[PDB]
Write a protein that binds this ligand. Sequence first.
Ligand SMILES: Nc1nc2c(ncn2[C@@H]2O[C@H](COP(=O)(O)OP(=O)(O)O)[C@@H](O)[C@H]2O)c(=O)[nH]1
Ligand SMILES: Nc1nc2c(ncn2[C@@H]2O[C@H](COP(=O)(O)OP(=O)(O)O)[C@@H](O)[C@H]2O)c(=O)[nH]1
Ligand SMILES: [Mg+2]
Ligand SMILES: [Mg+2]
Ligand SMILES: [Mg+2]
Ligand SMILES: [Mg+2]
Lengths: 155, 155
Amino acid sequence: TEYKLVVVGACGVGKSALTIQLIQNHFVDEYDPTIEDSYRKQVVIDGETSLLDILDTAYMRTGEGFLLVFAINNTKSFEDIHHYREQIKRVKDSEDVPMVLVGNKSDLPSRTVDTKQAQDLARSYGIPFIETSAKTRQGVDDAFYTLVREIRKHK
Amino acid sequence: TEYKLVVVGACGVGKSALTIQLIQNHFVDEYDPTIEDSYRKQVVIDGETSLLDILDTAYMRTGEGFLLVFAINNTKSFEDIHHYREQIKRVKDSEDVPMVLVGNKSDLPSRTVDTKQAQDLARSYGIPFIETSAKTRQGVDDAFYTLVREIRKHK
Ligand SMILES: Nc1nc2c(ncn2[C@@H]2O[C@H](COP(=O)(O)OP(=O)(O)O)[C@@H](O)[C@H]2O)c(=O)[nH]1
Ligand SMILES: Nc1nc2c(ncn2[C@@H]2O[C@H](COP(=O)(O)OP(=O)(O)O)[C@@H](O)[C@H]2O)c(=O)[nH]1
Ligand SMILES: [Mg+2]
Ligand SMILES: [Mg+2]
Ligand SMILES: [Mg+2]
Ligand SMILES: [Mg+2]
């Protein structure tokens, strides 16, 4: 009932925004990118009281679940996804580590990374893909909760 | 060729969900209830290129069409329908304003407001009644498009 989650991705994709929206239920219009802190919150996932220990990157090997986050209006971030994917494989020494691909900023119309690209990437990793928006709370809880559901399976 | 539409109803009925599903063609599992923003999208209604200016309540007097939205699994929302109905009559100072009654969340089985009650209410207002689901896109376009068709006959 206690989970250690880790949010990874390129700078400016909304790693901090997604975390704060989950923890403090509000949207941050700006957040210091050099800040890397762990956050804590007792929540209810699928009716079960769970403790979430989330690390907003800017221990790693103590992570049970990982959020691969990019922005749908940021091609470069999507390109950097594989870099972080492989880091997690090495730090965990495993092929099968609970992960979720996250497409943030789905509220923005200036989309450059279409659905097929993201879903093909997730298909190449065999992990779920969720479109999120930290501004509007869209898919935010689902992203973290799905990861926890992935951990439940592995454990 | 341009239309100003206003979506009203009780909190949590899916006003935001119905708007996003129309504009960005996706479903929001959660949306900040305190967010009231105007949205814009050029669409094709019955073959005719139209610009839709939609206000998602949480400007009013400039509304040409109004969506009266409740949830079929929300008796209270249905009860509050007349409240918003009369507000629009006052803000427009008119006895005849293009409106459409919308029963959202039709994808849910836990129904408490049957078709009889809704249709009887729509008949009491002399306006169309549309069953919608922002989750599955059911009746979403038809709801907004019908309202536009109501504006057409009105002018
Ligand atoms: N429109 C929109 N903007 C976002 C969203 N998430 C984050 N942002 C913006 O992106 C900027 C950088 O986000 P941040 O969380 O600091 O990126 P980080 O480097 O991964 O921590 C912030 O100023 C946010 O306002 C979102 O879902 N929608
Ligand atoms: N099953 C289902 N859920 C919906 C539908 N429309 C909205 N919802 C859910 O209802 C919740 C609140 O909807 P929202 O649009 O924020 O209500 P608002 O206060 O009118 O803006 C959201 O978390 C949606 O997931 C629908 O058609 N079907
Ligand atoms: Mg940050
Ligand atoms: Mg491209
Ligand atoms: Mg809303
Ligand atoms: Mg009854």
